[PDB]
Amino acid sequence: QVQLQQPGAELVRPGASVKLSCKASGYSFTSYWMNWVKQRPGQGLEWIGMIHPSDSETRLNQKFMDKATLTVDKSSSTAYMQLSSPTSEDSAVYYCARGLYGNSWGQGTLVTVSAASTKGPSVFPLAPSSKSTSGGTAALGCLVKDYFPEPVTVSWNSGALTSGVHTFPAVLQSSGLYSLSSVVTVPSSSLGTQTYICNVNHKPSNTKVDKKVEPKSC
Amino acid sequence: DIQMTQSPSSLSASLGERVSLTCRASQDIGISLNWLQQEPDGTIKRLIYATSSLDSGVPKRFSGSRSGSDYSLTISSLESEDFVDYYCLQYASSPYTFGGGTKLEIKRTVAAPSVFIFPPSDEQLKSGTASVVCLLNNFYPREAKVQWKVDNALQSGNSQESVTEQDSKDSTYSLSSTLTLSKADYEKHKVYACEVTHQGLSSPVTKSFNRGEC
Amino acid sequence: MIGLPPPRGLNLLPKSQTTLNLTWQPIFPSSEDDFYVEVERRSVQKSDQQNIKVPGNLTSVLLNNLHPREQYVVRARVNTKAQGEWSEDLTAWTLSDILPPQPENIKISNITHSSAVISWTILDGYSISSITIRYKVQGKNEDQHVDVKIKNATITQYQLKGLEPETAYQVDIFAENNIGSSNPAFSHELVTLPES
Numbered sequence A: 001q002v003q004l005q006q007p008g009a010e011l012v013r014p015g016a017s018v019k020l021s022c023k024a025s026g027y028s029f030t031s032y033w034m035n036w037v038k039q040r041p042g043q044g045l046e047w048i049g050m051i052h053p054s055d056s057e058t059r060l061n062q063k064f065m066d067k068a069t070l071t072v073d074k075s076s077s078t079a080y081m082q083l084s085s086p087t088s089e090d091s092a093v094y095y096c097a098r099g100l101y102g103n104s105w106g107q108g109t110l111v112t113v114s115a116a117s118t119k120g121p122s123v124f125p126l127a128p129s130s131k132s133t134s135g136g137t138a139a140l141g142c143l144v145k146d147y148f149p150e151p152v153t154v155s156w157n158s159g160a161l162t163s164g165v166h167t168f169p170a171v172l173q174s175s176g177l178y179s180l181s182s183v184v185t186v187p188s189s190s191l192g193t194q195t196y197i198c199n200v201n202h203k204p205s206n207t208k209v210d211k212k213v214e215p216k217s218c
Numbered sequence B: 001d002i003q004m005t006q007s008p009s010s011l012s013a014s015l016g017e018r019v020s021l022t023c024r025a026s027q028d029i030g031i032s033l034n035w036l037q038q039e040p041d042g043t044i045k046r047l048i049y050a051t052s053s054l055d056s057g058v059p060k061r062f063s064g065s066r067s068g069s070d071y072s073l074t075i076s077s078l079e080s081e082d083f084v085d086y087y088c089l090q091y092a093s094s095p096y097t098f099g100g101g102t103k104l105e106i107k108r109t110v111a112a113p114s115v116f117i118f119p120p121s122d123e124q125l126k127s128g129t130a131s132v133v134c135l136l137n138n139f140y141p142r143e144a145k146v147q148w149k150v151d152n153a154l155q156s157g158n159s160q161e162s163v164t165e166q167d168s169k170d171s172t173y174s175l176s177s178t179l180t181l182s183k184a185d186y187e188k189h190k191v192y193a194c195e196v197t198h199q200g201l202s203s204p205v206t207k208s209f210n211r212g213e214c
Numbered sequence C: 001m002i003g004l005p006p007p008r009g010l011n012l013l014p015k016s017q018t019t020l021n022l023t024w025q026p027i028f029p030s031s032e033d034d035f036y037v038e039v040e041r042r043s044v045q046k047s048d049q050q051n052i053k054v055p056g057n058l059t060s061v062l063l064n065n066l067h068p069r070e071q072y073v074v075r076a077r078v079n080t081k082a083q084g085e086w087s088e089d090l091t092a093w094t095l096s097d098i099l100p101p102q103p104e105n106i107k108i109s110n111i112t113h114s115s116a117v118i119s120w121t122i123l124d125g126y127s128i129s130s131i132t133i134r135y136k137v138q139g140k141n142e143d144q145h146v147d148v149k150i151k152n153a154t155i156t157q158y159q160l161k162g163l164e165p166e167t168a169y170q171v172d173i174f175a176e177n178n179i180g181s182s183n184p185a186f187s188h189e190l191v192t193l194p195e196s
Helices: B122-126 B183-187
Strands: A003-005 A009-012 A018-025 A034-039 A045-051 A058-060 A068-073 A078-083 A092-098 A109-113 A122-126 A137-147 A153-156 A165-167 A178-187 A197-202 A207-212 B004-007 B010-013 B019-025 B033-038 B044-049 B062-067 B070-075 B085-090 B102-106 B114-118 B129-139 B145-150 B159-163 B173-182 B191-197 B205-210 C011-014 C020-023 C036-043 C049-055 C060-063 C071-079 C090-093 C104-109 C116-121 C130-137 C146-150 C157-160 C168-176 C188-191
Touching: A003 A092, A009 A018, A018 A034, A018 A092, A018 A109, A034 A068, A045 A068, A045 B085, A058 A068, A078 A092, A122 A207, A122 B122, A122 B129, A137 A197, A137 B114, A137 B129, A153 A178, A178 B129, A178 B159, A178 B173, B004 B085, B010 B019, B019 B033, B019 B085, B044 B062, B070 B085, B114 B191, B114 B205, B122 B129, B122 B183, B129 B145, B129 B183, B129 B191, B145 B159, B145 B173, B173 B183, C011 C090, C020 C071, C036 C060, C049 C060, C104 C188, C116 C168, C130 C157, C146 C157
Parallel strands: A009 A109, B010 B102
Antiparallel strands: A003 A018, A018 A078, A034 A045, A034 A092, A045 A058, A068 A078, A092 A109, A122 A137, A137 A178, A153 A197, A165 A178, A197 A207, B004 B019, B019 B070, B033 B044, B033 B085, B062 B070, B085 B102, B114 B129, B129 B173, B145 B191, B159 B173, B191 B205, C011 C020, C020 C060, C036 C049, C036 C071, C071 C090, C104 C116, C116 C157, C130 C146, C130 C168, C168 C188
């Protein structure tokens, strides 16, 4: 079984070069070309170049001539790509792929170039409305504002509340910090009876919050 | 650089439907083209090699073909797992270049969103900022319009949207829209409103609240 | 006592997994002692040396009791009583006990509408006698193929010529020794350009 192993993510400070790795196993590393490909999130794909591990000959998309350096380490059967002076334009997933015709692909490394300091979120209730339909469905949630980096996880009632949950993909705010909300729809009859707690966990800052979300006093 | 014009960029289809994607090459590329599949988690897999060769272990319902500068990936009868993204790739000339991709999604009946508006918490107001959230829950198709009104004044430039991936069970989308204001701006205004336009609503639906009232 | 040069035309060749044969030219016809010639063989991977003498009338000896895939070093002396002057060192491998390893460092480059350059490497000491580049049109055309058999191990790259344009080939590279061929593996991929 061919296997190309790339780390899942790398945080990169603007201007500080980063060296991405792609470890090959299950085949003759020095007998196949190695390609690198760039994909901006939600965008299309871009070929960067390729290198042959046997003698490290490299062909590069001239677009990346002054951005990426391809090398190999034969003894560890690893191919490396180094990006110089990274900017926000370099944030993207970078894939490696074996063979002239890309017949095996790595899982890709998500590169995030950002100078933002690590920071835990604030959690605020999205309280179910006092106009909720007497016999109908109500909605309620948690706003998870101003954290870095990704990811945060959210559950409801320690995982008992699963159906009707929507945890939205985070947005990058103009401040450079992320924000997301998590909502759930529930019976209006259950408000005031059933407790509802969102469980928020942001490991990079060891923030863990359990926010009870109840209807506001009035 | 050779350009690969991949059409359509997005495509809605049904289970068991047959669909075809096409890339057109700006110059002659021969058979030097692959078709790629990308899962929502980012995994990339080669399906067709050299225009028409089906890679080992790829289901037979995938086939590739060519006509002149036109190259096509055909899925003979869609399965639930095929509603992902597809790219072609030319390597006749360097730098190799990709089509712009095709996002497949599942067609279902039109479903209107249920709409909810949420005021900022008193807790957040003390930090000096106010977020107002509008939730569009479980609608189809994906396209939707959300306009913010503060004392009946349409807002621009101060809201961000987030949309879920198509739901794996009921094939709907949900969307949040977040209005962010300074505490001082939020407290000098009374009426906060989210106005939603969507194919499943025969007219725009508005949810609103008055600051400081229940 | 006695000084005399060694015989040129010295040949050291494998004859089996356990024996190597050494040959040289006929003798100097001036005088003999009784005349004798002696030969010394030593292992490189191990430490074992053997001394042999064979009557001068002959032109070859057959080293024996060797081990497969083991390299040896030999020299020889024309000796009277005796003190001949030593030959230069000859190197040779016993023939292998095993199939040879697949070629490595396989590189496919410079593909045109009809040609492509392929290079490789092979390991020494396996008595590899030839390299074979085999190719065929991708898949369903498994009815005919081309073989380029290179019998000169000094060669490490070849330009394939006369390929059909905009066509996809499977390429394989084998090595052949006394025991057999490279264990087959996965074919390489090669797609020729369209005619310009």
